[PDB]
């Protein structure tokens, strides 16, 4: 029996929910963070200090307060999916925009013009941020940024920069445990394609939300798997060939989905279920390209009249491991046959010399790359399944941060970037009156991240923000030390992609909370 | 133990229920709509901005308030079934008539004469609307209306107008995903008949409430399927011929209904269950016409002594796909044999030259069309299962809007059409006194849609309505821009069929709520 | 633990229950009726406007109020079973007699003399009504009454009068769907006998509370079916001959009853269970007459030594369809052999020439008719399973109304008949004092139907009744128009059978409520 609450009532309750969540996440922000003890049903309390687990763990009771929390959770954690940082920045900015917006609307404003002005200011700030971003291109500044991302370490930074030089920034790098003492890298052959899970229960290792495997044979199709009878002679050669074979054909027609959850969940099957890597004419070429690289053929609809129903283990595919993340898949160590690989590379490099549109050119260049070059596996060693299993996580975080930095440059860390985007954009023209109110709201919640990063350390945040504002254009407060230092000298930076994405998601979700206009909730 | 409430008590409670529903739907009306966050039991909140999902999602608790909501839900959503728009307009008009009617009756009126006067005014307004409707016939204005319906887009408008020119307005157009980049159309052979689901669980794809399939063989009868023993040798050649065969004979005698729900629901059968396309002598001819077009014969009662009990896969039917909507069915790609098709077309075109009544003439001309012409499948491409799967929905909405416009013309959009039907019809003669009260009620709730479309944008609705009323006969307010512009110039239109249908359904359901006269409800 | 309430307490509570029911049914009375929204557990509200469904749907909670409602429900709805109309008139008259009776008894009266006087007045009014009834005999006035019963329609009236002329008023007429456009009639061979259901779960089509079938073979006995072992070799030739054979022998000995509910309910058997058509010596002749007409023989106890235990499909019976209503059964299309039919007709017409008593004469004349003449099936067509399936219901209602009118004539409609029986019968002699009180009660609740039919339309009922009372002897108010018109001219009539039956049932149930004298009810 749905319960329906109109206008400012629903907005007030949703804002209380998001207020609780942002209170509990803004604590663990900055370098001088703070612990937060999230109790666990069975076991010891988890003592964490990062803003993603706190947010995932909070979920209130009142249903108009759980909506406020759930909206920001979804938006911020999808920014986290996009790249790793700023799930806290997004949440705190969203709360600070939504609360001030609700306050101004309660004084008789127009919650369409408020949104219009806020989005005007947000787009202006994104432009100014891209104007102030300092890029990172040369393989030396790449090393410097990798070192800074790895908390001053040099070996991790050196190895990351070395791999980036070896495989090109727009390449593939993966991290694996090393059966040695010190770390090394070894370019191998293989590729990855941007298709992920179809079911969150398909994962193999509950650690890290991933699904890892080992040596396997491949089988692909250009047509959707329409039945489970098409999959009965699929696990047939699975246990009958000592290889957990791989099938990545196309979307499985629902029945196979629940069927395979039944036949792996609590049973433990070892096949794969990933979608098709592209669309249309290029997708068929990519399916046959994976087939030719690994050894087999596409079992769809073709002129050779091949069909997957027959269990043919003949020449499926020589792969290494398959690692299906949430939104990516990686086929490693493909050594089907040497002739076909160089042959297809020749074919692609020939068809490149055809002077076609800037869509087909790039869409075939991607196949060229995926078949010519290869991943750069990063074997990280240690003394220990603690030393290694920790240095792996640290180097993975450093790799993600430096790769996110490479694209859009870097800006001042510590939440001072938006603090520099403030003073440039008092040059906005507000049409209405409430557009100016939206601009004021953004100009007031632009110095929230720096304020909370300072207040977590302990010094009063207003004084620090004012000092930074009246400081130079490169001197920003440093919470780890306690004095205002620099960007180039002190080396505390944030990739621009993270700052921009956090600002965009905060603006979007705060607007959706500032003009709600009945919410409808079920009665408990 | 039924609970019984008499007279104005039941009407008051039902009106409170409809007041809540119309409050929650009138928010999302017009171009400058508003979000509404309908929470979901398992998952994230759904943030919607259209008035159909809100209405379907609301259902109250008090049983005399749930009736008020349920009546308007049913009526408005069947207008939505009839054509796509104005489920919000109907609901808001119905609430505005019912509330004012209850108020006038509470001052000692006669709730039969009130209804009589209201229906007088409604019929007058329908007449005036048809008087002011501007038709769309020439293939250029068709393109203009298609573009306007597709939000200014030209390629979608051009393709819609092109298909309409190719297949004739009173033809068949369908939309399918395109395995390419840009869109195209390809007239194929096939037809559709106006028979739908017999069970809402027969659907295949839960998306869009449809039941799609692929290549199949056909089998039809002129006599009802009286048993399930008649259907035991029906799925026999289903799994034994690799074609999910099609059976559209006549109504299945109940036992087969629940049986097939048991044998597909949680099992997954792939046959069809659609009724007969017509009535009597013509229906037999149509059944045999589908049979001759596809390849087989009608398995009913005839002189050739054929019966469906024998599993004869001999010459059933060469069809393409079958797509059973809620209230329509479409048999595509019929290539049974070339001789029989042209032969039967010759037979029909010969029997046309017989000078019969204007019933048999049209009833045979429909068969002539369904066998001579064919559908115009619209292959829409894109870059992507997001680009395509979105452009498909946009082009489907544009197609429905332009087809609904073709029939009865177009009128001024933005809810100004009824605002133009007001001033013409102060020339009504009310017999009683309460007939004049009904006329006043309609003349006051005729400018509700424009008022709410303006108030959603934000400007006070009374001033806008008054300005429009004292404006010209073609200048209407435009909420997307904010200034009064036009109909021909600005290009904001509403098909007449939608406005008229919304008005009729509002009048009907509001009358039924204005003279309720005990309602009987179960005790919880 | 029974709860026992004595005297005026139980009568007061039962009267409150009947007051609620009559309030809710009296609303939907007359031509200008009123809707009543009876909610349904699963689905949309049912918006009805007839007084039978309202009454069947009401059932209160308090057990001394549910008895008051249940008594009038039973009595009125059995009048409805007898003929179709006046389930509302009976209920309203019963409430108006019982309430006034309770009021007079509460002033110290004698609730035996009250009943005596009331029944005196009721019998007087029945006599006066039969005195004023105008018969309908000639085949032209039959057509006029059929047209009036079909709401002015002429084709329905013409077809009804035509069938009545063809088959004789005391004949058989049935209505079936027509596989054509316009309607027609076709006298066929067959008969019906007055025996119905033995179990309300034996029905086949839940629509209309009937049990319809198709071609079948017959088997009858003169002795009761004493076992289910006698029925094991009965469904044997049921599925083994492709005919759902018919067995109408005699009452089945209980075990077969629950057994056949088990073997059809949720299973779906297709045999029949109807009792014997008569009593004794004539019943045996009728059983063998059905046997000779259809083809077989009676499987009871005889000189030929035949018994049903053997499965003999030899010469059972050539029937058409069997349609078992609640209290009737119809065996259609009997073509066993031509010789035996005319032979038995000759035998009956010979034994007619024997000059016997006026009991055997009629009891054999009925067999003569059932074997010589036949039903007149009425094939009604339409454009459509809506046009037909509605015209069928309209023609069925018209047929029932005209047949009920043929027997006892017709009187003024609109509830003015009793209003004409009032003034004639102030010439009654009351013995006691309370007999005069009963007479006054009837003379005051005789003008209740006209008053409520007027008040439903809207004009104050007292003025209309007084105007009619001081009007002529043929001018009665007309609610559809609004002016006093006529009986012969305006053509608004009610069959006398309905008025008389409604009055009798109202009197009976009101008396039973006016002298209750403890009721005993279970504790919840």
Author numbering:
A (entry chain N), B (entry chain M), C (entry chain L): 1 to 524
Please share excerpts from the published article on this structure.
Human mitochondrial chaperonin mHsp60 is essential for mitochondrial function by assisting folding of mitochondrial proteins. Unlike the double-ring bacterial GroEL, mHsp60 exists as a heptameric ring that is unstable and dissociates to subunits. Due to its roles in human health, mHsp60 has been proposed as potential biomarkers and drug targets. mHsp60 belongs to an essential protein family called chaperonin that are conserved among the three kingdoms of life. The main function of chaperonins is to mediate folding of cellular proteins.
We purified active heptameric mHsp60, and determined a cryo-EM structure of mHsp60 heptamer at 3.4 Å. The map shows that the equatorial domain has the highest resolution (3.3 Å), while the apical domain has the lower resolution range (3.9–4.5 Å). The equatorial domains contribute most of the inter-subunit interactions, accounting for ~ 75% of the total inter-subunit interface and 44 residues involved in inter-subunit interactions. Center on the inter-subunit interface is a four-stranded β-sheet: β1 and β18 from one subunit connected with β2 and β3 from the other subunit. β strands are shorter in mHsp60 than in GroEL: 12 mHsp60 residues compared with 19 GroEL residues are involved in the β-sheet. Specifically, β1 and β18 are shortened to three residues, the minimal length for β-strands, from five and seven residues in GroEL, respectively. Thus, the three mHsp60 unique residues, T35, A516 and V112, diminish the restrains required to form the twisted conformations found in GroEL β2 and β18, leading to shortened β2 and β18 in mHsp60. Thus, the three mHsp60 residues, S57, D59 and E522, contribute to the shortened β1 and β18. Overall, mHsp60 has a much smaller inter-subunit interface than GroEL, ~ 1258 Å2 versus ~ 1674 Å2. Importantly, the unique sequences, T35, S57, D59, V112, A516, and E522, are specific to and conserved within the mitochondrial chaperonins of higher eukaryotes including human. Overall, the inter-subunit interface of the mHsp60 heptamer increases drastically by ~ 49% from 1258 Å2 in the mHsp60 alone structure to 1871 Å2 in the mHsp60-mHsp10 structure.
